[PDB]
Curated annotation (Swiss-Prot):
Signal peptide: none
Residues that hold Mg(2+) 3 according to the record: N425, T429
Family: Belongs to the terpene synthase family. Tpsb subfamily.
Name recorded for this polypeptide: Santalene synthase
Motif (DDXXD motif): 283-287
One annotated GO molecular function: magnesium ion binding
Amino-acid positions noted as binding (2E)-geranyl diphosphate in the UniProt annotation, renumbered to this chain: R246, D283, D287, R422
CDD domains, per database record: Terpene_cyclase_plant_C1 (cd00684)
Source domain of life: Eukaryota
Note on domains (UniProt): The Asp-Asp-Xaa-Xaa-Asp/Glu (DDXXD/E) motif is important for the catalytic activity, presumably through binding to Mg(2+).
Keywords, ordered alphabetically: Lyase, Magnesium, Manganese, Metal-binding
Amino acid sequence: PSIWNYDFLQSLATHHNIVEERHLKLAEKLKGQVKFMFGAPMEPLAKLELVDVVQRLGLNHLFETEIKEALFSIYKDGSNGWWFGHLHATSLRFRLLRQCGLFIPQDVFKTFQNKTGEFDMKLCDNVKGLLSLYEASYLGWKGENILDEAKAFTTKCLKSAWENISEKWLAKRVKHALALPLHWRVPRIEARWFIEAYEQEANMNPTLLKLAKLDFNMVQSIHQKEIGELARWWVTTGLDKLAFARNNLLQSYMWSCAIASDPKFKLARETIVEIGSVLTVVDDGYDVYGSIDELDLYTSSVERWSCVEIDKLPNTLKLIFMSMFNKTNEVGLRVQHERGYNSIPTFIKAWVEQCKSYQKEARWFHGGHTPPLEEYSLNGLVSIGFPLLLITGYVAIAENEAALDKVHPLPDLLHYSSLLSRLINDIGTSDNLKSIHCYMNETGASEEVAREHIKGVIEENWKILNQCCFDQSQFQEPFITFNLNSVRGSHFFYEFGDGFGVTDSWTKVDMKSVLIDPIPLG
């Protein structure tokens, strides 16, 4: 059974994993034994390692209060003797505390450097310590040159030392980390990878391992049902036939699930896959089905947000416009019923920025114009669609109708998250205009050098986003990680090319193990 088989996808609404009452009971028992692990007196570094594997296994949504207490208690120890001079301990402490909003200066790594700012080369025996530093180096901000050097230093030693690793489980971790750092992987996808990797690690706790498979399957059964209900809506509305040469519906659900996987985020996840799925069809409409003048009518019809003066639109654009208009209005009604507030005005502004961004790209393409990279980038962060999808997610979790006002003008959080997703997509694509061509045209650089440069811009916009995640004045979790998870989805879908638009790519392996196949227990 393939993931592009919609008959099979529609069958998940009734043929999903069945969670037995014995599994409900065993998960409750294991949850309590793990809670005891968090409360029991542990050496500080052993407590950090319990949080790390609980987060990596995807179980962190069951112990958010425990992880916060543990992390906050380590943030005020006062005694630094258990980590100072220790690479692994210093690296994990810096990463775990910065990942929850607790700032830790880059200066804590000055002690592993020489007087010229070179990390001492005696640290290559401790590969686990280099791995932890590598992972912590990606939490850096703009101007933290010690973290940059650590990243460069660890990538080199880890690459060179990889064939000399005797512990098989550490080699696996090092290969996985060099491919993508843990800060750039989507937590739900890494959870399934780590469940299979943890079972073979040194002092793997069998209780945490059984709770991870149990909870994973339990949460995976909730996705399968929504996936089957999504496939039935897609095929029933005939959106199936508006999509141009594509059978990539599950990819859209994988992205939505990457942003919000916990079962309690049903509204944000279903709301984001419905708007995103429909957005791939308006994308197809500005890119393949309409002419410059036809899309201008579409664009102005979106600014008026009306289905009145739409007779002047071609057949395929008439259906696409109505599909986008209806589904968004239907989501507005669903949100008025579930949260008691009107999102329609917030959705209209997001759909007009989206279509205006598609209109600039279409006009540029029509007149053979290639703008400066900065002008293309400001439009490109909108045209990628994350401002509309991330706003859709904020609509599902806002505190009241007046809180929807924080999304206009676009906040730095969504701005930088969307810019990264635009450039990451550009880098995973090979006559449509991208950032690569815009930089080539502005500097006379070659396609290979232009691509290496944009890879560097991505690296610097991650540093801005990292520091921008500390300004918790307007947004807070879980919306901050909804934003980070959207960029992590981009890294996963474009790691080796187009893994989102190609119906059969390397992306089906992880989509099948995360959304379709349950883990075996016994």
